[PDB]
Protein backbone atom coordinates (compact mmCIF):
# COMPACT_ATOMS: atom_id res chain seq x y z
CA UNK A 1 0.00 0.00 0.00
CA UNK A 2 1.35 3.40 -1.03
CA UNK A 3 1.88 5.52 2.07
CA UNK A 4 0.04 8.86 2.24
CA UNK A 5 -1.43 8.17 -1.22
CA UNK A 6 -4.30 5.72 -0.62
CA UNK A 7 -4.75 5.53 3.15
CA UNK A 8 -5.94 9.14 3.41
CA UNK A 9 -8.47 8.54 0.62
CA UNK A 10 -10.45 5.99 2.65
CA UNK A 11 -10.52 8.29 5.68
CA UNK A 12 -11.69 11.18 3.51
CA UNK A 13 -14.46 9.04 2.02
CA UNK A 14 -15.61 7.92 5.47
CA UNK A 15 -15.59 11.49 6.79
CA UNK A 16 -17.59 12.73 3.80
CA UNK A 17 -20.13 9.95 4.27
CA UNK A 18 -20.51 10.74 7.97
CA UNK A 19 -20.91 14.47 7.29
CA UNK A 20 -23.58 13.77 4.67
CA UNK A 21 -25.45 11.49 7.07
CA UNK A 22 -25.32 14.05 9.88
CA UNK A 23 -26.58 16.88 7.67
CA UNK A 24 -29.37 14.65 6.35
CA UNK A 25 -30.37 13.85 9.93
CA UNK A 26 -30.44 17.56 10.81
CA UNK A 27 -32.57 18.38 7.77
CA UNK A 28 -34.99 15.54 8.50
CA UNK A 29 -35.33 16.50 12.17
CA UNK A 30 -35.91 20.20 11.51
CA UNK A 31 -38.43 20.19 8.68
CA UNK A 32 -39.72 16.76 7.69
CA UNK A 33 -43.10 17.10 5.93
CA UNK A 34 -46.21 15.49 7.40
CA UNK A 35 -48.94 13.83 5.36
CA UNK A 36 -52.72 13.96 5.82
CA UNK A 37 -54.40 10.56 5.78
CA UNK A 38 -58.07 10.65 6.76
CA UNK A 39 -60.93 13.13 6.74
CA UNK A 40 -63.95 13.76 8.96
CA UNK A 41 -66.39 16.64 9.35
CA UNK A 42 -69.80 17.64 10.72
CA UNK A 43 -70.95 21.00 9.35
CA UNK A 44 -74.22 22.98 9.37
CA UNK A 45 -76.94 22.14 6.91
CA UNK A 46 -77.15 18.57 5.69
CA UNK A 47 -73.38 18.04 5.76
CA UNK A 48 -72.27 14.77 7.33
CA UNK B 1 3.62 19.16 -4.02
CA UNK B 2 5.15 17.30 -1.08
CA UNK B 3 4.39 13.70 -2.08
CA UNK B 4 0.63 13.99 -2.39
CA UNK B 5 -0.35 14.58 1.26
CA UNK B 6 0.06 18.34 0.78
CA UNK B 7 -3.61 19.14 0.13
CA UNK B 8 -5.42 16.06 1.44
CA UNK B 9 -4.67 16.99 5.05
CA UNK B 10 -6.45 20.34 4.70
CA UNK B 11 -9.56 18.66 3.29
CA UNK B 12 -9.45 16.10 6.10
CA UNK B 13 -9.29 18.85 8.72
CA UNK B 14 -12.15 20.75 7.09
CA UNK B 15 -14.33 17.63 6.94
CA UNK B 16 -13.58 16.76 10.57
CA UNK B 17 -14.47 20.28 11.72
CA UNK B 18 -17.73 20.24 9.75
CA UNK B 19 -18.68 16.84 11.18
CA UNK B 20 -17.95 18.06 14.71
CA UNK B 21 -20.09 21.16 14.17
CA UNK B 22 -22.99 19.13 12.76
CA UNK B 23 -22.96 16.67 15.65
CA UNK B 24 -22.78 19.57 18.11
CA UNK B 25 -25.85 21.09 16.46
CA UNK B 26 -27.69 17.77 16.73
CA UNK B 27 -26.81 17.50 20.42
CA UNK B 28 -27.93 21.06 21.17
CA UNK B 29 -31.18 20.57 19.26
CA UNK B 30 -32.12 17.34 21.02
CA UNK B 31 -30.72 17.76 24.53
CA UNK B 32 -30.18 21.40 25.43
CA UNK B 33 -30.48 21.91 29.21
CA UNK B 34 -32.98 24.49 30.45
CA UNK B 35 -32.26 26.70 33.46
CA UNK B 36 -34.78 28.23 35.87
CA UNK B 37 -34.19 31.92 36.58
CA UNK B 38 -37.00 33.05 38.89
CA UNK B 39 -39.92 31.65 40.84
CA UNK B 40 -43.00 32.88 42.68
CA UNK B 41 -45.59 31.11 44.81
CA UNK B 42 -48.90 31.64 46.59
CA UNK B 43 -49.87 28.84 48.97
CA UNK B 44 -52.25 28.46 51.94
CA UNK B 45 -51.27 29.11 55.54
CA UNK B 46 -50.26 32.71 54.89
CA UNK B 47 -47.50 31.81 52.44
CA UNK B 48 -46.82 34.73 50.10
Amino acid sequence: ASTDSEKVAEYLRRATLDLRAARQRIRELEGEPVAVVAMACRLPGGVS
Amino acid sequence: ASTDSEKVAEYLRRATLDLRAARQRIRELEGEPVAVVAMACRLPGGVS
Partner: antibody
Framework: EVQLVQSGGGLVQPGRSLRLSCTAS????????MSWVRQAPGKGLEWVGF??????????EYAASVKGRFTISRDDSKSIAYLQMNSLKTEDTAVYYC?????????WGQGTLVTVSS | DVVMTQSPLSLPVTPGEPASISCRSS???????????LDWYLQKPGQSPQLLIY???NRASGVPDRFSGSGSGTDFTLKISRVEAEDVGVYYC??????????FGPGTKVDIKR
Protein backbone atom coordinates in the same frame (compact mmCIF):
# COMPACT_ATOMS: atom_id res chain seq x y z
CA GLU C 1 -28.16 0.53 0.99
CA VAL C 2 -24.75 -1.23 0.97
CA GLN C 3 -25.05 -5.02 1.13
CA LEU C 4 -22.28 -7.59 0.85
CA VAL C 5 -23.02 -11.31 0.54
CA GLN C 6 -20.73 -14.32 0.16
CA SER C 7 -21.36 -17.62 -1.59
CA GLY C 8 -19.46 -20.84 -2.16
CA GLY C 9 -18.52 -23.21 0.65
CA GLY C 10 -18.72 -26.81 1.78
CA LEU C 11 -16.81 -30.00 2.51
CA VAL C 12 -13.82 -30.66 0.25
CA GLN C 13 -11.12 -33.31 0.47
CA PRO C 14 -7.47 -32.22 0.69
CA GLY C 15 -5.98 -31.12 -2.62
CA ARG C 16 -9.26 -29.96 -4.18
CA SER C 17 -10.10 -26.57 -5.70
CA LEU C 18 -12.82 -23.98 -5.14
CA ARG C 19 -13.75 -20.34 -5.63
CA LEU C 20 -15.57 -17.81 -3.45
CA SER C 21 -17.90 -15.07 -4.68
CA CYS C 22 -18.30 -11.71 -2.94
CA THR C 23 -21.26 -9.63 -4.15
CA ALA C 24 -21.52 -5.87 -3.60
CA SER C 25 -24.44 -3.54 -4.23
CA UNK C 26 -25.42 0.01 -3.37
CA UNK C 27 -22.16 1.85 -4.08
CA UNK C 28 -19.64 2.49 -6.84
CA UNK C 29 -17.59 -0.70 -6.51
CA UNK C 30 -14.76 0.60 -8.70
CA UNK C 31 -13.21 2.99 -6.19
CA UNK C 32 -12.98 0.72 -3.17
CA UNK C 33 -10.50 -2.11 -2.66
CA MET C 34 -11.52 -5.58 -1.50
CA SER C 35 -9.85 -7.59 1.24
CA TRP C 36 -10.32 -11.13 2.56
CA VAL C 37 -9.87 -12.14 6.19
CA ARG C 38 -10.06 -15.55 7.87
CA GLN C 39 -10.87 -16.51 11.46
CA ALA C 40 -9.80 -19.91 12.73
CA PRO C 41 -12.47 -21.89 14.62
CA GLY C 42 -11.46 -20.86 18.13
CA LYS C 43 -8.64 -18.38 17.54
CA GLY C 44 -8.02 -14.80 16.46
CA LEU C 45 -8.48 -13.06 13.13
CA GLU C 46 -5.69 -13.12 10.54
CA TRP C 47 -5.53 -11.10 7.34
CA VAL C 48 -5.28 -13.10 4.11
CA GLY C 49 -5.15 -10.85 1.05
CA PHE C 50 -5.95 -7.42 -0.35
CA UNK C 51 -6.64 -6.42 -3.96
CA UNK C 52 -6.12 -2.80 -5.00
CA UNK C 53 -8.32 -0.68 -7.29
CA UNK C 54 -7.97 -0.10 -11.02
CA UNK C 55 -7.53 3.63 -10.36
CA UNK C 56 -4.09 2.72 -9.02
CA UNK C 57 -4.19 -0.52 -11.02
CA UNK C 58 -1.93 -2.73 -8.93
CA UNK C 59 -2.44 -6.26 -7.63
CA UNK C 60 -2.46 -8.07 -4.29
CA GLU C 61 0.38 -9.26 -2.08
CA TYR C 62 -1.07 -12.18 -0.03
CA ALA C 63 1.04 -13.28 2.96
CA ALA C 64 2.90 -16.25 4.40
CA SER C 65 1.34 -19.74 4.21
CA VAL C 66 -0.85 -18.41 1.36
CA LYS C 67 1.61 -16.94 -1.17
CA GLY C 68 1.80 -19.24 -4.17
CA ARG C 69 -1.08 -21.33 -2.80
CA PHE C 70 -4.08 -19.63 -4.41
CA THR C 71 -5.00 -16.36 -6.10
CA ILE C 72 -7.67 -13.67 -6.25
CA SER C 73 -9.96 -12.42 -9.00
CA ARG C 74 -11.93 -9.19 -9.32
CA ASP C 75 -14.35 -7.99 -11.99
CA ASP C 76 -16.13 -4.74 -12.82
CA SER C 77 -19.24 -5.59 -14.86
CA LYS C 78 -21.19 -6.93 -11.87
CA SER C 79 -18.81 -6.13 -8.98
CA ILE C 80 -18.21 -9.75 -7.97
CA ALA C 81 -14.96 -10.60 -6.19
CA TYR C 82 -13.44 -14.06 -6.60
CA LEU C 83 -11.05 -15.92 -4.31
CA GLN C 84 -9.60 -19.08 -5.82
CA MET C 85 -8.76 -22.27 -3.92
CA ASN C 86 -5.88 -24.54 -4.94
CA SER C 87 -4.68 -27.63 -3.04
CA LEU C 88 -6.79 -27.03 0.05
CA LYS C 89 -5.29 -28.08 3.37
CA THR C 90 -7.01 -29.34 6.52
CA GLU C 91 -5.62 -26.49 8.62
CA ASP C 92 -7.32 -24.05 6.23
CA THR C 93 -10.69 -25.11 7.68
CA ALA C 94 -11.99 -21.80 9.05
CA VAL C 95 -14.65 -19.17 8.47
CA TYR C 96 -13.91 -16.64 5.72
CA TYR C 97 -14.99 -13.00 5.46
CA CYS C 98 -15.08 -10.47 2.62
CA UNK C 99 -15.03 -6.80 3.59
CA UNK C 100 -14.65 -3.35 2.06
CA UNK C 101 -11.49 -1.30 2.32
CA UNK C 102 -7.79 -2.03 2.10
CA UNK C 103 -6.58 -0.32 5.28
CA UNK C 104 -9.69 0.84 7.17
CA UNK C 105 -11.85 -2.28 7.41
CA UNK C 106 -15.31 -0.83 6.82
CA UNK C 107 -18.69 -2.61 6.56
CA TRP C 108 -18.13 -6.37 6.47
CA GLY C 109 -19.82 -9.38 4.89
CA GLN C 110 -21.56 -12.34 6.52
CA GLY C 111 -19.08 -15.25 6.50
CA THR C 112 -18.86 -18.76 5.08
CA LEU C 113 -17.91 -22.01 6.79
CA VAL C 114 -15.77 -23.82 4.18
CA THR C 115 -14.53 -26.99 5.89
CA VAL C 116 -11.81 -29.37 4.70
CA SER C 117 -11.71 -33.01 5.79
CA SER C 118 -11.63 -36.60 4.51
CA ASP D 1 5.46 -1.26 15.49
CA VAL D 2 4.42 -3.64 18.28
CA VAL D 3 1.22 -2.80 20.16
CA MET D 4 -0.40 -4.76 22.99
CA THR D 5 -3.62 -3.76 24.71
CA GLN D 6 -2.16 -4.02 28.24
CA SER D 7 -5.75 -3.64 29.47
CA PRO D 8 -7.41 -6.19 31.77
CA LEU D 9 -8.00 -9.16 29.48
CA SER D 10 -11.11 -10.20 31.43
CA LEU D 11 -12.37 -6.79 32.66
CA PRO D 12 -15.62 -7.80 34.40
CA VAL D 13 -18.31 -5.14 34.08
CA THR D 14 -21.70 -4.35 35.59
CA PRO D 15 -24.34 -2.08 34.00
CA GLY D 16 -24.88 1.48 35.17
CA GLU D 17 -21.33 2.56 35.94
CA PRO D 18 -18.90 3.26 33.08
CA ALA D 19 -15.58 1.62 32.26
CA SER D 20 -12.47 2.06 30.12
CA ILE D 21 -9.91 0.03 28.18
CA SER D 22 -6.30 1.19 28.03
CA CYS D 23 -4.18 0.63 24.92
CA ARG D 24 -0.44 1.07 25.37
CA SER D 25 1.76 1.20 22.28
CA SER D 26 5.37 1.34 21.14
CA UNK D 27 6.94 4.61 19.95
CA UNK D 28 4.22 7.13 19.16
CA UNK D 29 2.69 7.43 15.69
CA UNK D 30 2.13 11.20 15.24
CA UNK D 31 2.16 11.25 11.46
CA UNK D 32 3.44 14.53 10.04
CA UNK D 33 -0.04 15.55 8.90
CA UNK D 34 -1.02 15.70 12.57
CA UNK D 35 -3.01 12.54 13.30
CA UNK D 36 -2.72 9.21 15.10
CA UNK D 37 -3.15 6.10 12.96
CA LEU D 38 -5.06 4.01 15.50
CA ASP D 39 -8.46 2.35 15.14
CA TRP D 40 -10.85 0.31 17.29
CA TYR D 41 -12.95 -2.74 16.45
CA LEU D 42 -15.65 -4.70 18.28
CA GLN D 43 -16.65 -8.34 17.79
CA LYS D 44 -19.99 -9.59 19.07
CA PRO D 45 -20.36 -13.29 20.01
CA GLY D 46 -21.05 -15.12 16.77
CA GLN D 47 -21.39 -11.92 14.73
CA SER D 48 -19.40 -10.21 12.01
CA PRO D 49 -16.85 -7.63 13.23
CA GLN D 50 -17.72 -3.95 12.92
CA LEU D 51 -15.78 -0.70 13.10
CA LEU D 52 -16.22 1.68 16.04
CA ILE D 53 -13.65 4.51 15.88
CA TYR D 54 -11.06 5.37 13.25
CA UNK D 55 -8.00 7.64 13.72
CA UNK D 56 -8.16 9.68 16.90
CA UNK D 57 -11.70 9.81 18.27
CA ASN D 58 -14.24 10.45 15.50
CA ARG D 59 -16.56 7.45 15.95
CA ALA D 60 -18.41 6.68 12.74
CA SER D 61 -22.16 6.77 12.18
CA GLY D 62 -24.46 4.08 13.54
CA VAL D 63 -22.24 3.68 16.60
CA PRO D 64 -24.13 4.70 19.77
CA ASP D 65 -23.02 7.90 21.47
CA ARG D 66 -21.99 5.99 24.61
CA PHE D 67 -18.59 5.25 23.03
CA SER D 68 -15.80 7.83 22.97
CA GLY D 69 -12.08 7.47 22.33
CA SER D 70 -9.20 9.64 23.52
CA GLY D 71 -5.47 9.57 24.14
CA SER D 72 -2.14 10.83 22.85
CA GLY D 73 0.05 9.16 20.22
CA THR D 74 1.37 6.51 22.61
CA ASP D 75 -1.24 6.32 25.42
CA PHE D 76 -4.49 5.63 23.59
CA THR D 77 -7.45 4.75 25.80
CA LEU D 78 -11.11 4.18 24.93
CA LYS D 79 -13.78 5.51 27.29
CA ILE D 80 -17.22 3.92 27.48
CA SER D 81 -20.05 5.67 29.31
CA ARG D 82 -22.79 4.02 31.41
CA VAL D 83 -22.65 0.29 30.68
CA GLU D 84 -25.74 -1.48 29.33
CA ALA D 85 -26.66 -4.96 28.13
CA GLU D 86 -24.55 -6.73 25.47
CA ASP D 87 -21.25 -5.02 24.54
CA VAL D 88 -19.70 -8.35 25.60
CA GLY D 89 -17.07 -9.69 23.23
CA VAL D 90 -13.55 -8.91 22.02
CA TYR D 91 -12.13 -5.44 21.40
CA TYR D 92 -9.10 -4.87 19.19
CA CYS D 93 -6.49 -2.13 18.95
CA UNK D 94 -5.43 -1.58 15.34
CA UNK D 95 -2.46 0.38 14.02
CA UNK D 96 -1.86 1.73 10.53
CA UNK D 97 1.83 2.66 10.24
CA UNK D 98 2.70 -0.79 8.86
CA UNK D 99 0.45 -1.88 6.01
CA UNK D 100 1.19 -5.66 6.05
CA UNK D 101 -0.80 -6.36 9.19
CA UNK D 102 -0.93 -10.08 9.97
CA UNK D 103 -3.05 -10.60 13.09
CA PHE D 104 -5.46 -8.24 14.83
CA GLY D 105 -4.21 -9.34 18.24
CA PRO D 106 -5.31 -11.30 21.31
CA GLY D 107 -7.86 -8.64 22.22
CA THR D 108 -9.58 -8.00 25.55
CA LYS D 109 -12.67 -9.91 26.63
CA VAL D 110 -15.71 -8.34 28.29
CA ASP D 111 -18.15 -10.12 30.60
CA ILE D 112 -20.60 -9.40 33.40
CA LYS D 113 -19.04 -9.04 36.84
CA ARG D 114 -20.10 -11.53 39.51
Amino acid sequence: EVQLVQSGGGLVQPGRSLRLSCTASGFTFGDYAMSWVRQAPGKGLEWVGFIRSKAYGGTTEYAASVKGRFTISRDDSKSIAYLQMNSLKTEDTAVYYCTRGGTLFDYWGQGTLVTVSS
Amino acid sequence: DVVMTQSPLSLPVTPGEPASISCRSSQSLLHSNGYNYLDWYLQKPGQSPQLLIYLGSNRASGVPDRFSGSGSGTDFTLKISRVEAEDVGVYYCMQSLQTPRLTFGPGTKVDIKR
